Amino acid sequence: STRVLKVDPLFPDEKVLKEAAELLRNGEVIIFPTETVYGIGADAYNEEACKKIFKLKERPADNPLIVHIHSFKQLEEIAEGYEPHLDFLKKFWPGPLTVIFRKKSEKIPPVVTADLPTVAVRMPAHPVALKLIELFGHPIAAPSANISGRPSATNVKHVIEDFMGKVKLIIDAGDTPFGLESTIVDLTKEKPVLLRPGPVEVERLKELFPELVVPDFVRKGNFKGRPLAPGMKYRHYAPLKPLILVEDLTKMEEVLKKYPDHVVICVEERKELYDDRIVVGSLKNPYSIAQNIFSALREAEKMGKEYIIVEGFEERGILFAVMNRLRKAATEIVR
Ligand SMILES: C[C@@H](O)[C@H](NC(=O)O)C(=O)O
Ligand SMILES: [Mg+2]
């Protein structure tokens, strides 16, 4: 019996946010916008309400949730060992950055953290998310709003495809600004570790952290063992049709001929090269490509074609993050 309430992204109707806060108080799951992707959230201190997130997403128990906060004072409650990183955190928060810390809070149950001694924490730069958290009065545990393994919802149409009739409330604030999930950095080890590339660019983190480690699974998508964050273990971001990622574009002639029943996801500058194609954005504006990629995967899988074929991009700036997503999605990679 799902309700969809439109709110302004800058000054949302506090009445809609109070309705959402009341649902959260009742141990219900709601869907809300951020600057990255839509989230599906519960009271972070409510065990049974956080289990409902796992059940609703068809999500493996060992994939932990990000705890969304609105103030530095809430970070003092839920984490420890962060005092040396506060100057850093204050430069990027609120914003599209998630950090892994040692868990303090007795109050955040093991289901949220997948029984790990660490917690993933984000302060999102979206007035709707910040105002909801503050009105509700507890942190919100929220993964991406999508069935697990599917592309992350960046607008209410995608949320509706996955969750109509399954959640009481969806707050609609339109297309998310970035269209890609937060950068994840582990700050619990001697050297900081990138776990998921995102809108906070690898190049920027390397300026601040010369010793930043970038593990193989970030450049390949191939992690086994116990994941410390979202977006590491399992198939992700995947359309309902086989995804062929083409890193080496000189084989694009050969791929199209090997997989005849195709639609191509391509850039504006190569649009008049393919008969059937979805234009995801321009190479002159890489943020356009990040903004639309999950959308493009969802249109593409509805074109009644057997195979979705995607152009590769430079492993640089925001396109690093795009390629990480496409590699975790791809049924085949032509390199
Ligand atoms: C809901 C949103 O904040 C998202 N969550 C996730 O991908 O698990 C992110 O980190 O950008
Ligand atoms: Mg996700």
Instruction: Find the CATH number of the domain harbouring 164.
Output: 3.90.870.10
In short, whether 36's Cβ falls inside 6 Å of ligand 1 is yes
Ligand 1, atom 1, lies closest to the CA of 39
In short, whether 94's Cβ falls inside 6 Å of ligand 1 is no
Judge if 127 and 29 occupy the same domain. yes
Protein residues with C-beta less than 5 angstroms from the ion ligand 2:
144
Give the tokens for residue 90.
């204050």
Inter-residue contact 175 to 291 (CB < 8 Å): yes
63 within domain boundaries: yes
Judge if 65 and 142 occupy the same domain. yes
Q: Which domain covers residue 285, as residue numbers? A: 243-334
105 within domain boundaries: yes
In short, whether 33's Cβ falls inside 6 Å of ligand 1 is no
User: The CATH number of the domain where 308 resides is what?
Assistant: 3.40.50.11030
Q: Where are the beta strands (DSSP E) in 49-130?
A: 66-68, 79-80, 97-103, 118-122
- Indicate the number of domains in the chain: 2
Which of 220, 253, 271 marks a domain boundary? 220
Judge if 282 and 186 occupy the same domain. no
Judge if 216 and 248 occupy the same domain. no
In Å, what is the CA distance from 116 to each residue of 109, 200, 229? 10, 25, 10
Q: Is 63 within any annotated ligand binding site? A: yes
Judge if 184 and 40 occupy the same domain. yes
Three-state DSSP state, 68: strand
In short, whether 124's Cβ falls inside 6 Å of ligand 1 is yes
CA of 231 to the centre of ligand 2 (A): 6
In short, whether 123's Cβ falls inside 6 Å of ligand 1 is no
Judge if 153 and 250 occupy the same domain. no
CA of 9 to the centre of ligand 2 (A): 22
Judge if 209 and 247 occupy the same domain. no
How far apart CA 122 and CA 290 sit, in angstroms, is 20
In Å, what is the CA distance from 166 to each residue of 93, 122, 212? 32, 25, 41
Strand order in the sheet with 277-281: 277-281, 262-267, 307-311, 243-246, 332-334
Judge if 52 and 175 occupy the same domain. yes
Which of 188, 220, 252 marks a domain boundary? 220
Q: Is 68 within any annotated ligand binding site? A: yes
The experimental technique behind this entry is X-ray
Give the tokens for residue 273.
């090269």
In this structure, how many other beta carbons lie within 10 angstroms of the beta carbon of residue 11?
10
CA of 178 to the centre of ligand 2 (A): 15
